[PDB]
Design a protein around this ligand. Sequence first.
Ligand code: PAR
Ligand code: MG
Ligand code: MG
Ligand code: MG
Ligand code: MG
Ligand code: MG
Ligand code: MG
Length: 60
Amino acid sequence: PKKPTHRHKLEKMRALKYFKVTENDDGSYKVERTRQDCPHPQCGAGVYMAQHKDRQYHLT
RNA sequence: CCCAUCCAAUAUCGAGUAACAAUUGGAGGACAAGUCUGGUGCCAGCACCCGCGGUAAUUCCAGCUCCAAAAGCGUAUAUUA
RNA sequence: GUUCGCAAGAGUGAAACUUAAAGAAAUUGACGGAAUGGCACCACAAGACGUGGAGCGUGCGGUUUAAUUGACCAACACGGGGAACUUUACCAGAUCCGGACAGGAUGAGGAUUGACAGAUUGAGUGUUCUUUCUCGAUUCCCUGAAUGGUGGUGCAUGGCCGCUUUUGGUCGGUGGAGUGAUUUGUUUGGUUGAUUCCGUCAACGGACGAGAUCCAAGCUGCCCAGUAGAAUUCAGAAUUGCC
RNA sequence: AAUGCACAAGGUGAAAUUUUGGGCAACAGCAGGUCUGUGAUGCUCCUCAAUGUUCUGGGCGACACGCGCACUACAAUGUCAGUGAGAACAAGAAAAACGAGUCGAACCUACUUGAUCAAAAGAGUGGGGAAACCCCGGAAUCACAUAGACUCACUUGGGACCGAGGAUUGCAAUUAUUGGUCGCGCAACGAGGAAUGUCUCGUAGGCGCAGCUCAUCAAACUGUGCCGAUUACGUCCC
RNA sequence: GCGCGGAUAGCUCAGUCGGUAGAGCAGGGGAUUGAAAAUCCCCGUGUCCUUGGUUCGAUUCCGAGUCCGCGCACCA
RNA sequence: CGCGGGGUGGAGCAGCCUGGUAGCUCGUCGGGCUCAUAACCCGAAGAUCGUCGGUUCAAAUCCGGCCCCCGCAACCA
RNA sequence: CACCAUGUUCAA
Ligand SMILES: NC[C@@H]1O[C@H](O[C@H]2[C@@H](O)[C@H](O[C@@H]3[C@@H](O)[C@H](N)C[C@H](N)[C@H]3O[C@H]3O[C@H](CO)[C@@H](O)[C@H](O)[C@H]3N)O[C@@H]2CO)[C@H](N)[C@@H](O)[C@@H]1O
Ligand SMILES: [Mg+2]
Ligand SMILES: [Mg+2]
Ligand SMILES: [Mg+2]
Ligand SMILES: [Mg+2]
Ligand SMILES: [Mg+2]
Ligand SMILES: [Mg+2]
């Protein structure tokens, strides 16, 4: 009765996925991450999980 | 009036898209000249005669391009060959 | 209109209008409820075994249906068509691009690909809406196009098939005949399934088809076999009679 | 017959007149069929909610009816239940995949089993690349002094229709895929009107069997064998 | 003049004696054809004079009244 | 109106048992023959006997009342 | 010598 939309992928506006605080980086620390990977399924290296009500996400 | 003569005889206006612009009938045959493109689909129309047109029209309605005569060229009725 | 006639009629004799041929003689063909000679169990004869009647299978028509997707002797168990899905061409929906490549505007500060859970849905189908991560130039958005179609037209075609036709038929060359289309060769006679042969012959020389070649079956030679078979001779076993 | 080309009858022979049976077949043509065979094709239509292409579900198969073509019968020259003898053509498994450049499994099959108890199955174990295994290919008609049941009836003829278990093919069986079991059989049908088809000897007819379609399904078709006649060997009547 | 009678699609026309409408052609589209004609299917469709008395409602009943036909008349 | 005749399958007509899915010709259907149609051949269907009553075991017939159709007459001053 | 009638319009 009504035509569907034929979805295009949404732009994330200058961030696909993101890190943590204290961008000074005075030789003490690497920056922390904001999600996890749960590896070997399938890659786990740069695979970062979704929030989705803090649940999960690929796949892995 | 026209035509003719003239743009100095000391001394006369003027072409450019020379826009100051050719048309009238045709392109199957007789009969000179398109197996071009678009439209219509035995309709609309053409065709003196033969014939064209029934969804790929050498013939209709048009655009292009050609042919013929040309300040002319079609058509009709008489009339001679 | 007039002159003849007892009358039927006769003689004389137009036009308006209409039409693109009507005719004439020949040729080639097709056709005859026209002669003549042949042939064929897709003809009959003399017969066989059936179909048409019945029940079912299957194809065709019609009627239904959302839809029930060529052909009318030479269509109808045929399109190798005995389709549950697929096939598939039809109907109700749903995806995907398999719209290459160009040109123009977004574009890495992201063009875009894909998807878990829910809602949507016929669908534990991300198709889409919410959600956020992945993909990392492959794409996407416009414009121009192109490639796909078991879309149409077999009356635009190629190819193949069927059918004219199970018939013996067609064609040149050069000569003859006629203004010519066209004839002759290619024939009246016998003959064969056969323009097959013999003879005749204004024809003579050729080409194809027919025959030949090819396959299969029947008899047969050579070759041949621990992928075919046979006999024998010793051993082993079985019957062994009075019924 | 009258030269010739040849013909009939008989011989010879395995075979006697195209030996038999097929294949192949000229020239012209049909406005035959095929655009549903092709990456055969011109033109023209559709071309992103597409007439493309894929899913999902239907349909092609739906039945007052009319027709082609088969199949099964209407029975005693038979149906049944036994038992015997005994054919030919034929088919048969796999990929640059998944497994252990070599080998396996997909295909057909015998044999055992299932079996101190129905078929249909389901399982083992062999073999076969096919003249080598199936296979001494145990086809069905037929046969039988079978001292077998029926005895002329819509009947033990016929098996349409459909009811209930069950098991296999498939990813899926409902508008039963197919087999098997017990019911139903009171469904016509007793040899078929007008009409009509094919056929001249290993033929017609009967009989089955392979292959092909095929995961599952032959009343089909292409082949093959088996049993095996009636009539004509004529004519132009249609 | 009186009486008998008939009006329903663009036209033509059948009606259950007093419960609501039939076709067909003409029309618009398909199937068919080489295009047509025929042919078949599907579609637009008739407030029935005017109305009253109103059977649950007048087309179907009866009587009034446009329409258009038919039976029958000074007196010797 | 008097009087007289008839209503029968879609058409035209018959019908003497008081009675045959009532009969006839044509038509309508279904199949054949034909390339196709007609002719022709083989089949099958179709009747509120106009209607209501009554006689009867039984009615198209028999007796009626009605509705129609069709005439014969409808006289002499 | 029984009966044996007919096949729409253009076009190819
Ligand atoms: N290519 C052979 C052709 O045979 C034709 O002739 C054939 C016909 O005369 C005739 O054929 C007939 C046929 O007409 C008819 N319609 C059916 C008949 N069965 C045939 O018969 C022929 O074939 C069968 C083989 O099955 C045999 O019974 C018979 O011996 C044979 N004469 O027999 C000949 C076949 O041998 C023509 N001569 C010719 O078209 C051609 O040569
Ligand atoms: Mg044109
Ligand atoms: Mg022009
Ligand atoms: Mg059908
Ligand atoms: Mg010459
Ligand atoms: Mg009969
Ligand atoms: Mg006539």
